[PDB]
């Protein structure tokens, strides 16, 4: 399902 996206995981 909807894991958290690449962005948001950036930094």
């Amino acid at each position, epitope marked *: *399902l*909807q*894991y*958290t*996206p690449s*962005w*948001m*995981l*950036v*930094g």
Partner: antibody
Amino acid sequence: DVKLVESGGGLVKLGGSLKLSCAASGFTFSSYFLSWVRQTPEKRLELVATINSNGDKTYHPDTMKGRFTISRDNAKNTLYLQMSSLKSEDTALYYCARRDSSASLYFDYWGQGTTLTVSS
Amino acid sequence: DVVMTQTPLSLPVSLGDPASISCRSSQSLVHSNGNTYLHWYLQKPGQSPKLLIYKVSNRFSGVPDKFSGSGSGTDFTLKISRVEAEDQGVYFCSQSTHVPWTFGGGTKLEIKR
């Protein structure tokens, strides 16, 4: 210190609209992601919206979608949240919130939050 | 999205005792990157939540060692070794593996009598 300050709450008629601000002092705004979270009068859960830095990317669950819209002014250390067709189920305490930079996906700094009541 | 179910909803205690709050997501929490984004927050009567533990079991800067967290995938546990008066409020587990992020109903530490 790191201090976010929510403001602009109050009473609004149903289907009304209102703009919450969140002012962010004591750090490099342009660096962090922020969100708005909220707490149901029965004291719950509540993610509303999230935005990147120099905000070209945003997320809104599907529910909030249409009623809520996040934005920022890195050029001004302020995040916002334009609300638009308020249902009464939107009444709640609105928190401003900072994401940890290590990307561990958790909020390290919350504000005191503004109250919002939707009633005619 | 995933239903964070905490247990019990209420917890009566005498200071000095110790406690365990469960939290159980619906889907699993291992993210497609090995990270398990389960956290724990405390809310004190009248304040903003404050993060205690992140990534299942990482203490946040300034969180006393009485606190500790553990678990895997769907099931998780918050443990407190000796409860202080300071430790009383509502505790919540959020997850971030799945968007949108969700938080549990919260769990209340309250005085036993």
